[PDB]
Amino acid sequence: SALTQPASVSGSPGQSITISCTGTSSDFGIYNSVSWYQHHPGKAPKLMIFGVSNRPSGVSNRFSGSKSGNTASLSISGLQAEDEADYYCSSFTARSTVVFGGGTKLTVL
Amino acid sequence: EVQLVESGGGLVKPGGSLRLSCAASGFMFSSYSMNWVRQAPGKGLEWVSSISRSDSYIDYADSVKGRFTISRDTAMNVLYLQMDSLRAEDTGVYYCARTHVFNMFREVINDDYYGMDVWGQGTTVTVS
Amino acid sequence: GSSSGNWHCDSQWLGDRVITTSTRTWALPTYNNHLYKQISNSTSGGSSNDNAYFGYSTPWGYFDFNRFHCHFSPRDWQRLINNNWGFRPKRLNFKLFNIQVKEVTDNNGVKTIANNSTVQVFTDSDYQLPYVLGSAHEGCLPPFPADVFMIPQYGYLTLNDGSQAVGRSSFYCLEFQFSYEFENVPFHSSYAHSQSLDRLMNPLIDQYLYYLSKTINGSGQNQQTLKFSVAGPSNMAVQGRNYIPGPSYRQQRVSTTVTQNNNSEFAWPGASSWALNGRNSLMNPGPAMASHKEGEDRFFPLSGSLIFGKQGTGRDNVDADKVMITNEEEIKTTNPVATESYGQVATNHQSAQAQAQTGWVQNQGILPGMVWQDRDVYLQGPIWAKIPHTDGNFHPSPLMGGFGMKHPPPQILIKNTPVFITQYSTGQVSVEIEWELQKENSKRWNPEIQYTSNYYKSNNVEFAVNTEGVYSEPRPIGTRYLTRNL
Amino acid sequence: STRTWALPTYNNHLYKQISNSTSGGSSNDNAYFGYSTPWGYFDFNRFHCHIQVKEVTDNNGVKTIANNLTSTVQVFTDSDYQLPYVLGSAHEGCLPPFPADVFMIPQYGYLTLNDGSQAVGRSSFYCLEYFPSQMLRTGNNFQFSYEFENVPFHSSYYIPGPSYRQQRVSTTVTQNNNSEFAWPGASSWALNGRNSLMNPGPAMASHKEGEDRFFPLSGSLIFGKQGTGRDNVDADKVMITNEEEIKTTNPVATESYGQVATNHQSAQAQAQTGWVQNQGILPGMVWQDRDVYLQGPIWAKIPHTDGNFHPSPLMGGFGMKHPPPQILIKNTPVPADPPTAFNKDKLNSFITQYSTGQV
Amino acid sequence: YAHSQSLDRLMNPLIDQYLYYLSKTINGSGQNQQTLKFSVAGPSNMAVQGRNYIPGPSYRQQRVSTTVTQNNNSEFAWPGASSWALNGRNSLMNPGPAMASHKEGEDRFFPLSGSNEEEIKTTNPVATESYGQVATNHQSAQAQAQTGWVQNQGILPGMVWQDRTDGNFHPSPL
């Protein structure tokens, strides 16, 4: 809740995909935190993006992100069958809680 | 190789109480924040509670506040979530994550939040 | 009854040079009860022809300081790798003193230790003995000065046929301070190139060279054409480059998340090897090559990386978290990845009836214009190894790291003079090495990466003793932090 | 040699980050991260190659050029080789071949480490302003000398040298296959997961004796004719050099190095052989390096590493560990009128200005 | 002279190395048994020990047995031989890089064009044998780990070997 993110997105292999979640008031992306997670069903969720667009050591270059105004978006390029998972965005909040979006299941065709 | 393994998930009637433990291995367990998140059946991830590096600051999601108690023994690295007065909404899969900070030596008091770094596969807690 | 030496351990930092003294206490048993004994695989059962060996075991022990951490405390190492672009030994001073010879008697059923003799010690500076200091064996001086250590046995392998010997095998019967001068060797590089080999171009300006952009106009029949374009910032893969990455011999890719690995025993069958005289020998560590592509850091080459054990690690079939797997991430810029192919080559001649076919290059030798970085050295890893004496060699620097030398520090052999009588000895050993440094003159604006001990809260202090008095080194430490242009 | 040069003002006196994301992102092989500087550089690196200040004002609708006497021009050499060295990539912007030509001085920018368009922590940012430089007004001059380190004579005149096979393209289009094999077919060396074309590659003969219509796909220096377009020019618009001079001691770039037996013959098996597509150095190989041309680059810098083999560059010329230094130059910014009240922000309004002179 | 040691046996037989290798990739027969287990490279298993130097380059030859019945009944004298082609003219590879003629124990096999050299077998690969193996593909749950043969290998850093214009490498003639 508190972060509106589309129910599901889909794309053919090779095509770029933009998943985008929006938020309300000020606390959306307070400090630098808008963070994107990759959750495969039944396995540990992974932190795809930490910060507005910085991405950690483990993550592949294909994943990227940006935040324009009130909207942050995860951009997946060079799509593959291994990129099929659930994708969540999160932002630290002013009371020192984290808030996850509903999440988008990306089904590659 | 950093691993966090959740344990203690099970089946407990509503109103009962369950204790969940997270066994940390491979890293210094007392240098990191640690916190629990929850995925209800057929829903996205949700956050439960947190505990700081020196245990000074304990936080709670609005919904579970007062019904849960998070604490870490620290003699042997482990994490504990005491679930009391369970409801039907507390069904889910509980994960144990650690907020990741590259440098533990702060240079400034307000540090931009970087998000969770290591996660467990999670255990299933079921109420009937 | 009067001391023969003092206790010197400390490190002087004088300008561009470092003088690191280290002193330890040693204990020398009596090996082989004063005998020389043939050994071979057949005594051990000799099941495999790859492991078949022949050689002798001698009573002598040898002092081996060949690992870095013997000479550097973790602070001196941090101080070394952060502030310097290179180092290399200059002089070697060695002293042996405070000899103590004990005799053990069994009176009734209890043992008594009382004073007694002489101690035989000499160095081989003519290199007439087999040189065992280069194999990264154990028995070296303890990393931590308060540890008392045991001296390793000395034995040497010679030419074999299976277990049996041959007429060309040799038998060597090996029957206090000195100084040494290291021969001139290149400064070990301890920096990470900021730039990759392929990006050395100027991003703002085109090349004047042309490449072939289009071989056909469009879909259809008889559409052949030749079109050319200018190689420039828009397409950088096609530019002409003066230099190309170093050689590669591919390694199998193992993943540290075990469920991604194939469910079969491919540990020995899968692995890269070099056959010699009919004995398949694993390729370890192999040429210097990066460990993984960016983001693939979970993968590691099967045989292609130095693996060090954590303090207390068992000897056989230890898990993955009991071992510390180093990785050559720093040298990825100029070297191919160990788990990936070196490129592609054309396998045939195209024509009207045949498509242009290419194929992978699994191994690639030296070609003119290649550049590469050598393998890193660690706090734990070796310092030197003796270059084999041969008619030829290429880039003799050893594959496990360190400084390859044609005249390394000599072997130092020691044993207790026979009298038999149960006997052993102990004493003090001080070894001094002078190092030379190369300062970083870089004008880089933004801050370097440095090796830092994370401010942490934990039960124990890294690189220090625990409650039972066991010194421990938490992680392998690389030498490459500062940067330099390619 | 002497030329007359013109120096503009780059980036409005700014250092600017440049990644492919500004250029659209391209694909992984083409990804680059780097910075672009206001400084320009002199490049005489090509064979055939061998102070005044103006301001611009728009008054009414017309522009008027007028001498600015008090302006200064900053120029230094990097003789410590502490900057990235781009003079070895054979870029345009050299002194012109014909002495009556006046040329524009190129912009200096440098690429650093990058994953995709993003920068890792090992990335460097060099501020050229942090180098001491000599500031020249219209009457001052600048000069220095250089001494080439000892390098082998370029040659104009056991087993054959190494080979890395190249694909064979024919200038008669009917002979060539009716498919797009320009990128898939080409030989390449991959580094850190970025496939990069092999160009020109090792020095190898261009074609077998007697066939002059076949050229290796990425194995030769192809020069454009005077006034050749930038994209998708035809075949006769480019000058393709051929290496056939070295066919004596070097393998053919379109041919295999030879054969190697692939199995053990016996009464149960016929002797088999196979083709050697690429061959590294062996003991006893002798080879010629690539020729230099009137248009070709004179030198290139040996990347500083722990190892190299036969460092002489693959595009020809003299590989050197200390090549001639880079000479960087810029117009010292003279701001427009500042406000009458202090504003901590840096001044973003500068007088339009450029400078010219001789080399 | 001729070496009294071999390139792979330079180790001390009596001591363990502090380096580890990957001994066991599965617990046992079954399904989903993947695991990683490491061992100490030591006197027991010498083949897997880490080594600072590796044998010289090799360009393979055909193996002709001096007992004529062993040889295949066909004309492999010219087609079989390994050669280097220059300017479109195939030239036989003779004598070739310095390499041992045969493994220890086989005196009836000689490399076709490679002529015995057995003295240099310590640091030099055998002329009629592959230089080694190399992994062809990645492994995953779907694909097995594969290894291809190496028929020729040029110079690499760290190679040592015994012997028998613009540039040359180790000019000592063949």
Decide if E7 contacts C388 (C-beta within 8 A): yes
- Do chains A and E touch by CB distance (3+ pairs < 8 Å)? no
A33:B95 CB<8 A: no
User: Strand, helix or coil at C74?
Assistant: helix
Q: Amino acid letter at D164?
A: Y
Nearest by CB to D189, which of C231, C343, C358? C343
Report how far residue C378's alpha carbon sits from residue B13's, in angstroms, rounded to the nearest whole number: 56
Question: Does B72 contact chain C (CB < 8 Å)?
Answer: no
Torsion B2-B8-B10-B13 (CA) sign:
negative
On chain C, the residues whose CB falls within 8 A of the CB of D187 are 343-346, 358
Of D190, D200, D202, D133, nearest to D164 (Cα)?
D202
Give the pairing type, strands C224-230 and C244-245.
Answer: unpaired
Chain centroid to CA A35 = 6
Return the structure tokens found at E163: 């012997």
User: Strand, helix or coil at C64?
Assistant: strand
Nearest by CB to B103, which of C256, C320, C454? C454
Decide if C85 contacts C483 (C-beta within 8 A): no
Q: Amino acid letter at D98?
A: F
β-bridge mates for residue C351, sequence order: C354
Q: What are the CA-CA distances from residue C340 to residues B95, C120, C269, D194 (Å)?
A: 36, 53, 19, 11
β-bridge mates for residue D327, sequence order: D42, D77
Nearest by CB to D283, which of E71, E80, E169? E169
Decide if D355 contacts D52 (C-beta within 8 A): yes
Q: What is the dihedral of CA E61, E67, E72, E77, to 10 degrees?
A: 50
User: What part of E 84-143 touches D (C-beta under 8 Å)?
Assistant: 84-88, 90, 93, 97-98, 112, 128
C321:B1 CB<8 A: yes
On chain C, the residues whose CB falls within 8 A of the CB of D188 are 237, 343-344
D267:E70 CB<8 A: yes
Decide if D65 contacts D53 (C-beta within 8 A): no
Question: Does C394 contact chain E (CB < 8 Å)?
Answer: yes
B-contacting chains (≥3 CB pairs under 8 Å): A, C
Nearest CA of chain C to the CA of B18: how many Å? 29
On chain A, the residues whose CB falls within 8 A of the CB of C255 are none
Report how far residue D176's alpha carbon sits from residue D167's, in angstroms, rounded to the nearest whole number: 11
SS3 per-residue string spanning chain E: CCCCCCCCCCCCCCCCECEEEEEEEECCCCCCCEEEEEEECCCCCCCCCCCCCEECCEECCCEEECCCCCCCCCCCCCCCCCEEEECCEEEECCCCCCCECCCCCCCCEEECCCCCCHHHHCCCCECCCCCEEEECCCCCCCCCCCEEEECEECCCCCEEECCCCCEECCCCCC
How many CB atoms are located within 10 Å of the residue C473 CB?
A: 19
User: What part of C 424-443 touches D (C-beta under 8 Å)?
Assistant: 441-443
Decide if D77 contacts D144 (C-beta within 8 A): yes
Peptide bond into E95 cis (omega under 30): yes
Decide if C216 contacts C304 (C-beta within 8 A): no
Interface test with C, best of A46, A57, A64, A77 (most C CBs within 10 A): A57
Report how far residue C380's alpha carbon sits from residue C473's, in angstroms, rounded to the nearest whole number: 9
Report how far residue D5's alpha carbon sits from residue D37's, in angstroms, rounded to the nearest whole number: 19
Nearest CA of chain B to the CA of C333: how many Å? 24
User: What part of B 106-125 touches A (C-beta under 8 Å)?
Assistant: 110-117, 119-122
Q: What are the CA-CA distances from residue C330 to residues C204, C253, D121 (Å)?
A: 27, 18, 12
Report how far residue D12's alpha carbon sits from residue D351's, in angstroms, rounded to the nearest whole number: 10
Distance in Å from the first CA to the final CA of chain A: 28
C457:B31 CB<8 A: yes
Torsion C49-C55-C57-C62 (CA) sign:
negative
Burial D25-43 (b: 16+ CB within 10 A, else e): bbebbbbbbbbbbbbbbbb
Please tell me what DSSP assigns to residue C268: T
Q: Amino acid letter at C434?
A: E
On chain C, the residues whose CB falls within 8 A of the CB of E143 are 262
Nearest CA of chain C to the CA of B21: how many Å? 20
Decide if D165 contacts D253 (C-beta within 8 A): yes
Q: Which residue is it, tokens 């630290």? A: A92
Q: What are the CA-CA distances from residue A89 to residues A5, A62, A97, C295, D75 (Å)?
A: 8, 17, 14, 21, 50
Question: Does D264 contact chain E (CB < 8 Å)?
Answer: yes
Minimal-distance CA residue of chain E relative to C59: E14
Minimal-distance CA residue of chain A relative to D121: A57
* DSSP code string of D187-242: -EEEETTEEEE--S-S--BSS-TT--SEEESSSS-EEEPTT--SSSB-GGGEEE--
Interface test with E, best of D151, D158, D159 (most E CBs within 10 A): D159
Decide if D206 contacts D242 (C-beta within 8 A): yes
Nearest by CB to E44, which of C44, C262, C303? C44
β-bridge mates for residue E91, sequence order: E84
Please tell me what DSSP assigns to residue B35: E
Nearest by CB to D115, which of A53, A61, A77? A61
A35:B57 CB<8 A: no
Of C447, C203, C449, nearest to D125 (Cα)?
C447
Considering only the C-alpha atoms of chain E, give the largest distance between any 2 of them, rounded to a whole number of Å.
62
Report how far residue A75's alpha carbon sits from residue C146's, in angstroms, rounded to the nearest whole number: 56
* DSSP code string of D60-124: TTEEEEEE-TT--EEEEEE-S--S---TTS-BS-PPPSSTT-EEEPPEEEEEE--BTTB--TT--
Q: What are the CA-CA distances from residue C476 to residues C231, C296, D187, E107 (Å)?
A: 43, 20, 38, 48
Of B3, B6, B4, nearest to B92 (Cα)?
B6
Q: Which residue is it, tokens 């250092």? A: D15
Report how far residue E60's alpha carbon sits from residue C344's, in angstroms, rounded to the nearest whole number: 22
On chain B, the residues whose CB falls within 8 A of the CB of C459 are 30
How many CB atoms are located within 10 Å of the residue E132 CB?
A: 25
Of D135, D81, D101, nearest to D329 (Cα)?
D135
Nearest CA of chain A to the CA of D182: how many Å? 21
Please tell me what DSSP assigns to residue C84: E
Q: Which residue is it, tokens 């997270």? A: B22
Alpha helix segments (H runs only) across C3-46 = 41-44
Q: What are the CA-CA distances from residue E49 to residues C40, C386, E38, E121 (Å)?
A: 17, 17, 13, 20
Of E105, E161, E4, E53, nearest to C159 (Cα)?
E4
